Curated annotation (Swiss-Prot), chains A, B, C, D:
Belongs to the avidin/streptavidin family. It comes from Streptomyces avidinii. The chain holds residues 38 to 157 of 183 of the full protein. This is Streptavidin. It is found in: Secreted. Homotetramer.
Length: 122, 122, 122, 122
């Protein structure tokens, strides 16, 4: 259990900030603030993590979602990050993400961005 | 707002079942049961959707996560679906997904599956 | 060997047309014409397929690339499809694709679209 | 035109080696040697790049495929990398990739890995 290891403030390579609490059950709750895109201030996030990971040196699987609507803006989109938490001196969350925008059916083919973010504690 | 449209029971092309409640705020909560993979019975899911979508015929962006741990099994993995809800006579949720397994750092390159699921009400 | 099975004209769900020749060695060569996006007429494609697939009912792995420059337009982008050919009465090529646009380093986070195309012979 | 800039030997974060020639037309040809996975020695690659990129500081879009069959092994799979070449003192090719294995239709849902490689000249 990486409940303690996960909980806190994380920063990615874009300068975005992810603030999360991990629950004993597997819950992830918090806020996300993106340094890029059609976004301002904090957005709610929710997700899940493996609260009983393998003890063989494997990372801890997790994922979370942000819908990009808050009281300032609505970018009609949602991002999900899927990845793993790796503990130890340089702890990291290594993710890949899918950002889907709401589109008309004609534009559905261009609805979804894919990328990768790495989060660190500093 | 597709709070009503989203809430309920959905089925994908694999025969999996997604049961979800959409909150007025943008919350998604429920359970997922996969017809395939290292999975049995129901797993908690959480996510977010755009509760005030565009009124121009665009779909409604949403995403959710499942960590594949429940009281029966732990597959040390999490899937996130990112996609859009499209309302109307044949309502659908069209998604793409990332399934990340916890791995050692040597195997991180093969940690993540990608696919696409389409959910319908029947 | 699906050299014969692959070679020919294929159509996806968007109305795009893929014309390909499979070589005995594993080469794929041909042209692609997209029904959507910043594209007109035919673009060169090249790729590779597994010329000696498993005989256990598995599909045949393959992939190809298109850079979206031809004598009519240059959309400063490339798509790669990665997937599998499935032979038999309803033959199909089931793919997932990554479309990367050239961007400045500030916009690199939004450089890459992901989607899925299914190609059929009719 | 980055024909000169692209052509040569590149190394990624896994220790794999990509040797490529860029043609004036947009062709990419060469060999790939993976440091990981079910692979040994060199495999043919082919692909395409944007031979007339934007002059606004944007990267150069490109992609290539490897089918993982050579005279030593056949891993019944193909990878496509899609990304961009960024020139200058630290030149890089930043990619995302899809690795599809041939599978039975029952296992198609787990056919495709996704990841990201960064290639440098040293
Ligand atoms: Cu275990
Ligand atoms: Cu709006
Ligand atoms: Cu074999
Ligand atoms: Cu231009």
């Amino acid at each position: 259990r990486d409940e303690a290891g996960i909980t806190g403030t994380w920063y990615n390579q874009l300068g975005s900030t992810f603030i999360v609490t991990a629950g004993a059950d597997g819950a992830l709750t918090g806020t996300y603030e993106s340094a890029v895109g059609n976004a301002e201030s904090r957005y709610v996030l929710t997700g899940r993590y493996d609260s009983a990971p393998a003890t063989d040196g494997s990372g801890t699987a997790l994922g979370w979602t942000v819908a990009w609507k808050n009281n300032y803006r609505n970018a009609h989109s949602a991002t999900t990050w899927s990845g793993q938490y790796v503990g130890g001196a340089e702890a990291r969350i290594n993710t890949q993400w899918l950002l889907t925008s709401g589109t008309t059916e004609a534009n559905a083919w261009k609805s979804t961005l894919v990328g990768h973010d790495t989060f660190t504690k500093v």
